[PDB]
Amino acid sequence: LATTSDHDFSYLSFAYDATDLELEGSYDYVIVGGGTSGCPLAATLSEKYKVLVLERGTLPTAYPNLLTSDGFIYNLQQEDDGQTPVERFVSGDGIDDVRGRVLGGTSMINAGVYARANTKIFSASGIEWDMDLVNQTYDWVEDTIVYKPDKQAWQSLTKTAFLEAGVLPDNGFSLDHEAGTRLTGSTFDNNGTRHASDELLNKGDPNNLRVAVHASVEKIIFSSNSSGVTAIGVIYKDSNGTPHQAFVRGEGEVIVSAGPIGSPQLLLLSGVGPESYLSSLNIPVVLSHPYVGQFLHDNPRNFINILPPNPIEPSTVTVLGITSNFYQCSFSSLPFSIPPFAFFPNPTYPLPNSTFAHFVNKVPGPLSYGSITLNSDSDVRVAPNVKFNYYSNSTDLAHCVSGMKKIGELLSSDALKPYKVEDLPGIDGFDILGIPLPENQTDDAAFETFCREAVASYWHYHGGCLVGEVLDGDFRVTGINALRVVDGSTFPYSPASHPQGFYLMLGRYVGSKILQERSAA
Ligand SMILES: Cc1cc2nc3c(=O)[nH]c(=O)nc-3n(C[C@H](O)[C@H](O)[C@H](O)COP(=O)(O)OP(=O)(O)OC[C@H]3O[C@@H](n4cnc5c(N)ncnc54)[C@H](O)[C@@H]3O)c2cc1C
Questions:
Q1: Residue 466 is part of which domain span?
Q2: Are residues 509 and 382 both part of a single domain?
């Protein structure tokens, strides 16, 4: 774990704008997307080789509101205009959602909840894992951007309700995703500074790394020979319009780390994708990869909003109610005078005028998947369509009912009694904002309805470029040399209640693997 301090911007000595980058240049590694996974992977690769991260968004400095936790709601409430750190999109489903557009990626705009993955993930996954490295990697991240949270009035009040509700055992303060109520790590220090993955660039090597911002990567270039396809570089546009080239050297590679939506998109626009689909759009086919854009997952978020009669303090989420089929936590916040996008599933949702609390549920997996589709010719700056097919698989919905039933109990416990508006028993007495639970806690066919109408995103989407589908165990795009994907898009199921821990890790992991195979060869 780390000691509270200022956000570390020493990496700016080697961060550039893309208008300030050479029109063409050679590197040992090119990393598209300077996000959650890119930054650590950049840092890692730079220890021993020449590296360039390329990032469509801005320095965090440009938008001072994502350096603190107070700003968390704010970033969401700001209009999307192409420049700002939060990109507003809606699914084919109709559910409002965001993703980051800033150096440090979505770890720069997120809720900052840290958790190490479910150990039982590592074995049933498709990659074979070095567990001395994984664990030692978590150390390296934690030792830098992860902090032990201080008691907070409202959160400890949620710990007690979870333990009263049945969520056992009490694990105390622990980083490991296990079953039971616990108090987990956060990327918000005890002054409320945001520490995100941009700071892991500082863990790099200043003499070897070159970050670039406002570099929208448009195309991955390939080479005919010899004898098979290889990545040679990428093309990116600067803010003026000028396209630049970045090339890989002998023995080098290009690594896409643009997230569930970015990677499938860049690959598809570069003509690695399902043949009949690319033809359909007149995109020249470079390798027929049927599974690119496929198997996109997003865990449904189902919640209850309460408006206590007395005010409650805003909190950063640190207390978690982990059960096998779903995960829970609770957010308290100042009122909303302008709606923060993606918090609620549509913009016409009532806003809270006083302080309120938000009890949420996240189904694991999930099992239901969808698809990335392009709709703009090529324009990388045009957000692709995604469909997630919420509650399409009947098991996701069972776990929703369960989880909502369990929130029903959270509301019944002795801890929540001072937050009811009147002294009515059970779940009644709460002043509800938006859609309330079913009255009868034994009405399956009614809770199923709740789950389906109330659903929003947990923002934890992942998929679209799976190992054992598009990538091999080393994270290579199969049948293409020198091309790799590392990020949210690489696995079909969520690693924990909260994924950034896994992804931050997954970045420096693949780093060391690549570095290793550079010494054993
Ligand atoms: C509102 C919100 C809150 C969240 N809160 C939590 C939390 O509390 N705890 C937790 O564990 N997880 C949380 N998450 C999820 C977690 O932060 C993400 O799943 C994690 O960031 C994984 O992202 P990634 O590394 O795959 O890609 P990202 O971190 O999104 O990185 C992708 C980067 O690549 C860039 N990019 C995209 N396309 C291009 C292009 N073609 N050219 C150049 N650059 C490009 C983007 O600008 C972006 O910066 C939250 C997510 C959201 C949306």
A1: 9-146+192-298+368-390+458-521
A2: yes
The answer to whether the beta carbons of residues 3 and 104 sit under 8 Å apart is no
d(CA 47, CA 41): 10
Q: Indicate which CATH number applies to the domain containing 475.
A: 3.50.50.60
Experimental method for this entry?
A: X-ray
Query: Residue 3: inside a domain, yes or no?
Result: no
Where does a domain end: 436, 457, 478? Answer: 457
Contacts of 302 (CB under 8 A, 6+ apart): 360, 361, 400, 403, 404, 450, 451, 454, 455, 456
**For ligand 1, is residue 107 a contact (CB within 6 Å)?**
yes
Q: How many CA atoms lie within 13 A of 470 on its CB side?
A: 29
Resolution (A): 3.0
Please tell me the distance between residue 111's alpha carbon and the centre of ligand 1 in angstroms: 11
Q: Is the CB of 105 under 6 A from ligand 1?
A: yes
Task: Supply the DSSP symbol for 194.
Answer: B
CB of 98 sitting under 6 A from ligand 1: yes
CA of 212 to the centre of ligand 1 (A): 17
Tokens for 77? 């409430």
In a domain, 322, yes or no: yes
Could you give the number of structural domains in the chain? Answer: 2
